Design a protein around this nucleic acid. Structure first.
Lengths: 65, 38, 109, 131, 121, 110, 145
RNA sequence: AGUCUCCCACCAAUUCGUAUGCGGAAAACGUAAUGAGAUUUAAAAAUAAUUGUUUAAAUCAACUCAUUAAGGAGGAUGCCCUUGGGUAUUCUGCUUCUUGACCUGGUACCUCUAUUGCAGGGUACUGGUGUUUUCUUCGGUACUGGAUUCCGUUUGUAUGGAAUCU
């Protein structure tokens, strides 16, 4: 399994997560792009600043006193 | 651990414009924690 | 390009009734000439538009419009139960209109 | 045959739920997060369908095929491409890539089991009442 | 007699409007050149082939001037087409001191000749 | 004069002077708010849209989009004649007195 | 508070200094006879050394010391004779005057250094270079007729 | 500028359904009246962010914490004023009403699985702290770029179904 247990919690390893699933990623990329899969350029465009958002905190919230 | 690194390099050369930067500026985390913050 | 007189009023379905904003039929886009705009000034359904206006002015029909205002949970349950319909050949994500258990909403444009 | 695909799918659903519970507060306002939520809900629906098929002790239900074919045509053909495009755009942005790659791989893996069960029970679909 | 003229029906889908310059009678020459160059550069990323240049009435002369400029200056293929444009005119019909703006209206069609000018890359 | 409606006691207690549009929370989370004339309207969205409104809503041709304005603050009166089962000979004079006789014409009536 | 840089674009033009051969008078003919080519003995450290020598000989000691702190040749190739030199915004005029006062190479004689575009960014410099290269092809295509 | 916080999709509600000093969509946000406090304290020092000094420690000024729910009516007191009216404080007291902490068991009625005992869901009522020790995110729905083509339709819905490429 690509994930492991620890004393703290349950952690995920990216390495095996993508290494075990390589042929599936290849099939997905060939299903999305058929003629540009053999090429190597920049296909995906940058996110527009209008759609860009900001990151919040990891805590829940703070109650009033 | 050469092959999966090369594959994700080929993966970044599609989205990003300079694929070799996230590894040098240490932007590809090998581990990501999944636990409610205490 | 349109003339001054252009007022279209009717009774529309609830906006939450729709799942996605599906676009209307676009196949007669090329065959749009001035004859249609010329005939628009002649052809005009005064009766139905006046009925909708009188329904919006009168406070009894305006209150009856709030007869059965379904909740988001009810609309989600209807969308979930339409997943199993009698025609088992086409996927429908919307929900049909009912002549009894549905509110008629009047619009003015 | 179905047991392996169902086990793999629900096992990856575990990771879907875990990563969602982890990254909720960080990116509540995002488009890739919304696509992730929709995909998680669809996967939960399909998995609970297959579980209802399983604990019945024998694999037969008629509404099950209908609603599974309903969800199959939604998950495979339409929702897939926008999901992939957003998942690759959020990683091309450069802000958060280490989980974007995992998201892409997770979509790639959840698509394969879907098409696998599709091609497995297409014969059942053409057998029962349609196609 | 008082009579006003509205513009002509324009039905553009999403991209026929983008790669198309409508040359007015008051549009300057250099601004037209600049916008035509911008359109020519942005076409193949919009996904088209040519740039439409539409003008009718008084602007036809300078539209043909813009065309023959890029014809030999940049050596780019040009295509000229002669079309008819129907315009609706709102006139007052005879049939109290009232403003002439608020009066009975009648629509009348009028046909005019126009030139469409496509420029290749 | 019709009073404030009954929404949420918490939010209804906040205003107490200036009424709220049915999209108050939405716009307040999107645009800036202000209170001028017994009401609370929007001023301008957070993102700058000087050149955006020009190319979208203006008289330009290159308009691929739409702009939505919350015009619920505009108050309206519906006036009807109950004195008779006939034409509005009373509303004729009422409108001719209120507005110029531009309004009281054959065009806007027919 | 912020390091302000400014790049200078320069070109090497060879005038047809030959009185025994008559020349054709037009646009593209003189453009081709002025943009013929650069000699083989052309490099980045050979042009930087020459411009440093010229700057030290014309301005002086402090005049060369103040400009030689951030004086580098970023991009240059001998195929078209277009180079981009980096310098500061304070000594940019001094670098332009040094480019103007460039007499000759140690082995190659009879050449002119022409500064074309100067700006504080490399993207606009590349854009202007592409625009100039596109403009050059127009007169060529017109004269080939 | 700054390792600070928050908005930038909704949710008659497992979704902070929060009428709680005032304003505010929120804010680890502004300000108002009173009382007290100094490692002997609720908490700052000489065993989340920020700042070179980094609140106070005769009085003032500054920081922290602890109370004061919105509107209408009656009485008393103080001021201009002495028919009367206006403002401020204090006591009695009414109006402001969406059959909702969560969860377990029993009873009563209806529907599906195509006879029943039984199996699951919903609603109305009663009883109880019931191992709600994961005291930090765990609910539902939503294809938001553009182009074109095929098919059915006054027997029913006046519009719906699906396909290719970027």
């Amino acid at each position: 399994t690509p994930s492991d247990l620890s004393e703290s919690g349950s952690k995920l390893n990216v390495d095996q997560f993508i290494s075990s699933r390589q042929f599936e990623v290849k099939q997905l990329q060939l299903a999305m792009h058929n003629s540009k899969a053999a090429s190597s350029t920049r296909i995906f465009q940058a996110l527009p600043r209008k759609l860009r958002r900001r990151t919040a905190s990891h805590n829940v919230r703070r109650i009033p006193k | 651990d050469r092959t999966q690194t090369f594959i994700k390099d080929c993966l970044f050369t599609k989205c990003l414009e300079d694929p070799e930067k996230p590894f040098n500026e240490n932007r590809f985390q090998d581990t990501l924690l999944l636990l409610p913050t205490d | 390009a349109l003339p001054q007189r252009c007022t279209f009023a009717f009774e529309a379905i609830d906006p939450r009734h729709l799942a996605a904003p599906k676009k209307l039929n676009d196949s007669q886009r090329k065959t749009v000439n001035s004859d249609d705009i010329l005939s628009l000034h002649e052809n005009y359904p005064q009766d139905e538009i006046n009925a909708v206006f009188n329904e919006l002015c009168d406070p009894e029909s305006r209150t009856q419009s709030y007869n059965n205002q379904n909740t988001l949970k009810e609309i989600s349950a209807r969308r979930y139960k339409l997943l199993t319909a009698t025609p088992n050949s086409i996927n429908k994500t919307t929900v049909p209109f009912k002549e009894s258990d549905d509110p008629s909403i009047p619009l003015v444009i | 045959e179905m047991d392996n695909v169902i086990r793999s799918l629900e096992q990856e659903y575990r990771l879907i739920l875990l990563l969602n519970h982890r990254n909720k507060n960080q990116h509540r306002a995002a488009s890739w997060y919304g696509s992730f939520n929709e995909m998680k809900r669809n996967c939960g629906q399909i998995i609970t369908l297959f579980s209802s098929r399983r604990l019945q002790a024998k694999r037969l239900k008629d509404v099950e095929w209908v609603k599974l074919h309903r969800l199959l045509q939604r998950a495979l053909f339409r929702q897939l491409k926008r999901w992939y495009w957003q998942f690759n755009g959020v990683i091309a942005l450069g802000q958060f890539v280490t989980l974007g790659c995992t998201l892409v791989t997770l979509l790639a893996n959840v698509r394969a089991l879907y098409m696998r069960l599709w091609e497995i029970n297409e014969t059942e679909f053409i057998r029962c009442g349609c196609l | 007699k008082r009579v006003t003229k509205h513009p002509s029906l324009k039905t553009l889908t999403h991209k026929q409007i983008h790669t198309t310059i409508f040359v007015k009678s008051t549009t300057p020459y250099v601004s037209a050149l600049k916008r035509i160059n911008k359109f020519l550069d942005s076409v193949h990323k919009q996904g088209s082939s040519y740039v439409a240049v539409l003008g009718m009435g008084k602007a036809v002369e300078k539209t043909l001037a813009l065309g023959c400029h890029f014809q030999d200056q940049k050596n780019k293929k040009i295509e000229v087409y002669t079309k008819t444009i129907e315009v609706l005119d709102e006139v007052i019909t005879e049939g109290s001191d009232v403003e002439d703006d608020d009066k009975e209206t009648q629509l009348k069609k009028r046909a005019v000749s126009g030139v469409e000018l496509r420029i290749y890359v | 004069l019709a009073p404030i409606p009954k929404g949420r006691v918490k939010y209804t207690k906040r205003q107490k002077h200036f009424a709220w549009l049915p999209t108050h929370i939405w716009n307040a989370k999107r645009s800036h708010m202000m209170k001028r004339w017994g009401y609370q309207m929007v001023w301008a969205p957070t993102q700058k849209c000087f050149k955006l409104t020009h190319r979208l809503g203006g008289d330009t041709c290159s308009s691929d989009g739409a702009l939505c304005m919350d015009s619920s603050y505009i108050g309206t009166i519906i006036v009807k004649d109950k004195s008779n089962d006939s034409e509005g000979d009373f509303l004729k004079s009422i409108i001719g007195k209120l507005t110029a006789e531009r309004a009281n014409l054959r065009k806007y009536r027919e | 508070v912020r390091l302000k840089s400014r790049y200078i674009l320069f070109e090497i033009i060879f005038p047809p200094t030959d009185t025994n051969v008559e020349e054709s008078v037009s646009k593209a003919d003189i453009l081709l006879s002025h943009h013929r080519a650069s000699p083989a003995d052309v490099s980045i450290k050979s042009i930087l050394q020459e411009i440093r020598r010229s700057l030290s000989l014309n301005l002086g000691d402090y005049g060369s010391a103040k400009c030689n702190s951030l004086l580098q040749l970023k991009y240059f190739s001998n195929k078209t004779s277009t180079g981009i030199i980096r310098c500061h915004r304070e000594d940019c005029d001094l670098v332009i005057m040094a480019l103007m006062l460039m007499s000759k190479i140690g082995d190659v004689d009879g050449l002119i250094v022409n500064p074309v575009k100067v700006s504080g960014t490399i993207k606009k410099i590349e854009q202007f270079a592409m625009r100039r290269n596109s403009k050059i092809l127009n007169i060529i295509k017109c004269s080939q007729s």
